[PDB]
Amino acid sequence: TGTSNLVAVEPGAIREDTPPGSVIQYSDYELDHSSPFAGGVAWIEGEFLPAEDAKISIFDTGFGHSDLTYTVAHVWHGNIFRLGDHLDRLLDGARKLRLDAGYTKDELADITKQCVSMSQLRESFVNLTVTRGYGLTHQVYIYAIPYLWAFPPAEQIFGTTAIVPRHVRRAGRNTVDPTIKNYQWGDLTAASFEAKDRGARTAILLDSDNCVAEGPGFNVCIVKDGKLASPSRNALPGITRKTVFEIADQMGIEATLRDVTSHELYDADELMAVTTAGGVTPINSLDGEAIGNGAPGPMTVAIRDRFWALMDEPGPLIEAIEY
């Protein structure tokens, strides 16, 4: 086939069908296609560009050594979500990689919001990448393209399916460090192919001690006896996870970042995937199981629906794009 179960990260449809009456609904608008920026904008080497033309030097060490970090923010109903936290994480990871963006956090925010505004997209997948660059000048690339779904909207509402790979584990923090968001998906791609080979949508990877790590492009949250847990070690410190933990705390639910063993993963009351590109996804079954009754669990539903409500509530988590 040559195609995994992972969403292709490329410019796509401006809207996609979502379940009627569900908490996920795209905005009603039209693109002004006389503007070449309509539908997708990239900012490469200091120049704003139409997304379809966005190109980088093949000699960027961000390619040949994947020597880079990045972050992804989402725009929903014209509002960008937690951009400041994303910029903090991006710059903190770049510092750990000895990468110097050359721009301040405020400058990157302005450029990012400008990419979104120019694209006209009310729902957008927004990437900031900082690479080691080439002759030695580190490079910053930003783009805003139509919204991308790690799991289709239908699975956000009605749940998805997962396996634990028989043949793959997540790279550990002492090898290709997953606590810094990176393009090095060798293990994640391998796990996605194993999932597709086995008829599942996605994979939950373990680390070398058989503790839960994360999935291809998402953190995993585990519900047991009314408590919420999520791996602390070999997993990205996700912003969706952070939001889910804030939501849980407000609902009076105890949420803990800790080691979650493989025993606990298989014994879960509920499982969910959380990531910027699509939010909170119920996981109905594991290794051919229906965790619980095989449909989205009550805590997952409460947290997911609350998560999407935050996208429209004025407050510190969202900033409107000027457009």
Automatic annotation (TrEMBL):
PANTHER family: AMINO-ACID AMINOTRANSFERASE (PTHR42743), AMINODEOXYCHORISMATE LYASE (PTHR42743:SF11). Belongs to the class-IV pyridoxal-phosphate-dependent aminotransferase family. Keywords: Pyridoxal phosphate, Transferase. Gene3D superfamilies: 3.30.470.10, D-amino Acid Aminotransferase, subunit A, domain 2. The keyword Transferase applies. InterPro entries: Aminotrans_IV, Aminotransferase-like, BCAT-like_C, BCAT-like_N, Class-IV_PLP-Dep_Aminotrnsfr. Signal peptide: none annotated. Its cofactor is pyridoxal 5'-phosphate. This is Branched-chain amino acid transferase.
